[PDB]
């Protein structure tokens, strides 16, 4: 019988998601990889237990995570029932619809049919009465935004999601989505964009829009899929040189490169949380350990920018 570490809320920093009542853990765990039927459930279980023990209260899923599609939700559902049920109200659990889940015209994209039918499937797979956050997973250019937004509003009003969010929406469209949801009376809680030292698109307008609108943000691929780790220490030659120079700065800060890379995403206090992936419990411990040194000075930021813009 699993018993959550009694010190878990001392080990983690919780950050308010935009202008809302929700505080997310600075580090959240994504189930994008390592929770399907091609990996071992013993390991999946160990990752979730380690995460909650360290104070990670947010687990992010999607209908099609696995492989195969739906298996991450099923495995999470089993582990939730077996180990976490007494603490479900201490967790923020998300899922999504918007990429390809099942074959045919109703198993992908942004229709009301797909969003409603898919959340019903997700709730069944996970064994939940509701999710905390339901996302539209990517934009659908060919479906009216109001249909998709009204499906999100309907799912909140009917108690299948407490809050809703959007993912992979460029700034212009995000603005439209946010304003529609506000008008419907179910405000967008959060935006999930890709953001790391190596992918800074959100700094071109998205982050400022979200701050304007009171919407939170949770960065995915914050380690640039593993590039911002020890992987290439012990990609292009220019990339490798950048990774070595960033790693030296991380060492100077008493951090692994991955730790500095996670800390850096929260450096301006305009991103709420970082969503990590993990295949082994030590990667979760390392991520949470980033909190020992979150601060970046102006000098450190300039040093990093010069490394990133460096050609030699």
Ligand X SMILES: C[As](C)(=O)[O-]
- For the annotated binding site for NADPH, the residues are 32, 60, 65, 167-168, 223, 225, 231, 277, 283, 286
**Alpha carbon distance 38, 204 (integer Å):** 38
Applying the rule CB under 8 A, the residues between 165 and 194 that interact with a second copy are 185
- Residue 98 near a second copy by CB under 8 A: no
Helix axes 71-79, 41-53, angle to 10 degrees: 60
* Bridge-based pairing state of the strands 14-16 and 23-25: antiparallel
**Alpha carbon distance 273, 16 (integer Å):** 9
Q: Where along the sequence are the contacts to ligand X (CB under 6 A)?
A: 32, 62, 167-168, 220
CB of 273 to ligand X, least distance (A): 14
b/e map 105-129, b = 16+ CB within 10 Å: eebbbbbbebbbbbbebbbebbebe
Q: Which does 140 bind (CB under 5 to 8 A by kind): a second copy, Na ion, ligand X, none?
A: a second copy
Q: Which does 223 bind (CB under 5 to 8 A by kind): a second copy, ligand X, Cl ion, none?
A: Cl ion
- Residue 57 near Na ion by CB under 5 A: no
8 Å CB contact between 99 and 62: yes
Please say which residue, 88 or 194, places its beta carbon nearer to Zn ion.
Answer: 88
Applying the rule CB under 8 A, the residues between 45 and 74 that interact with a second copy are 45, 57, 68, 71, 74
**Alpha carbon distance 50, 84 (integer Å):** 12
Could you tell me the end-to-end alpha-carbon distance of the chain, in angstroms, rounded to an integer?
55
- Residue 159 near Zn ion by CB under 5 A: yes
Nearest to 115 by CA among 67, 166, 71: 166
Instruction: Figure out which of the listed residues 39, 63, 192, 217 binds Na ion, where binding follows CB under 5 A.
Output: 192
3 state SS for 191-205: EECECECCECHHHHC
Q: Which spans of this chain sit near a second copy (rule: CB under 8 A)?
A: 1, 3, 8-9, 14, 16, 19-23, 36-42, 45, 57, 68, 71, 74-75, 78, 86, 89-90, 92, 102-107, 109-114, 116-117, 121, 132, 140, 142-144, 147-148, 150, 154, 157-159, 162-163, 185, 214
Q: Which spans of this chain sit near Zn ion (rule: CB under 5 A)?
A: 158-159
Q: Which spans of this chain sit near Cl ion (rule: CB under 5 A)?
A: 154, 157, 221, 223
């Amino acid at each position: 019988i699993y018993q959550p570490d009694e010190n878990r809320y001392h080990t983690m920093e919780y950050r308010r998601c935009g202008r809302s009542g929700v505080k997310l853990p600075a580090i959240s765990l994504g189930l994008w990889h390592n929770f399907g039927d091609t990996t071992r459930v013993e390991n999946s279980r160990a990752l979730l237990q380690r995460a909650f023990d360290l104070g990670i209260t947010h687990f992010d899923l999607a209908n099609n995570y696995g492989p195969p599609p739906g298996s991450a939700e099923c495995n999470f559902g089993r582990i939730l029932q077996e180990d976490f049920l007494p603490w479900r109200d201490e967790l923020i659990i998300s899922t999504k619809a918007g990429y390809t889940m099942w074959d045919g015209p109703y198993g992908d994209w942004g229709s009301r049919k797909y969003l409603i039918a898919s959340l019903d499937q997700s709730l069944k797979r996970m064994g939940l009465e509701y999710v905390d956050i339901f996302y539209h997973h990517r934009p659908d250019p060919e479906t009216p935004l109001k249909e998709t937004m009204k499906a999100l509003d309907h799912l909140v009003r009917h108690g299948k999601a407490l809050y809703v969010g959007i993912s992979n929406y460029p700034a212009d469209l995000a603005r439209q989505a946010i304003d529609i949801l506000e008008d419907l009376g179910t405000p967008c809680l959060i935006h999930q964009p890709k953001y790391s030292l190596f992918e800074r698109w959100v700094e071109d307008g998205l982050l400022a829009l979200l701050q304007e609108k009171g919407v939170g943000s949770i960065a995915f691929s914050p380690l640039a899929g593993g590039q911002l780790t020890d992987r290439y220490l012990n990609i292009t030659a220019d990339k490798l040189e950048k990774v070595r120079r960033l790693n030296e700065l991380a060492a100077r800060r008493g951090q692994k490169l991955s730790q500095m890379a996670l800390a850096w995403v929260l450096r301006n206090d305009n991103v709420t949380s970082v969503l990590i992936g993990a295949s082994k419990p030590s990667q979760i411990e390392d991520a949470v350990g980033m909190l020992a040194n979150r601060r970046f000075s102006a000098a450190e930021c300039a040093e990093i920018d010069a490394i990133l813009e460096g050609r030699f």
